[PDB]
């Protein structure tokens, strides 16, 4: 006879339990990365703001030199 039957060795194991990976860095790592990015941005903004102040002083002194003719 022929009928719907599982095979001679049966069917294989089937996973039925939860599997969460558990991934990412430790919280100290992202805190250190954020703090380092903050410090780098602070340093770059400091340098560029000082340069901008120097350029503004230069432009203002050019204006002061140009004033009497106007």
């Amino acid at each position: 006879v022929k009928q719907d039957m599982p095979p001679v060795g049966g069917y294989g194991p089937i996973d039925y339990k939860r599997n969460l990976p558990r991934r990412g860095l430790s919280g100290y790592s992202m805190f250190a990365v954020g703090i380092g990015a903050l410090l780098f941005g602070y340093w770059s903004m400091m340098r560029w703001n000082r340069e901008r102040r120097r350029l503004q002083i230069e432009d203002f002194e050019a204006r002061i030199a140009l004033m009497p003719l106007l």
Partner: protein
């Protein structure tokens, strides 16, 4: 299925999730665990189907 069983449910081993607070969160977790136990029962059914008439 565990206290007053019917046709072949006493021949299948599976777990019963039990909540702990009565909120909707525990019921949703119970439904997810019931899905997992349904997969387990389906595997047990596919590995234990006997020949015969219908």
């Amino acid at each position: 299925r565990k206290t007053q069983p019917y046709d072949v449910y006493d021949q299948v081993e599976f777990d019963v999730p039990i909540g702990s607070r009565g909120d909707c969160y525990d019921r949703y977790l119970c439904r997810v665990e019931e899905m997992r136990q349904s997969i387990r029962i389906i595997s047990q059914c596919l590995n234990k189907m006997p020949p015969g008439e219908i």
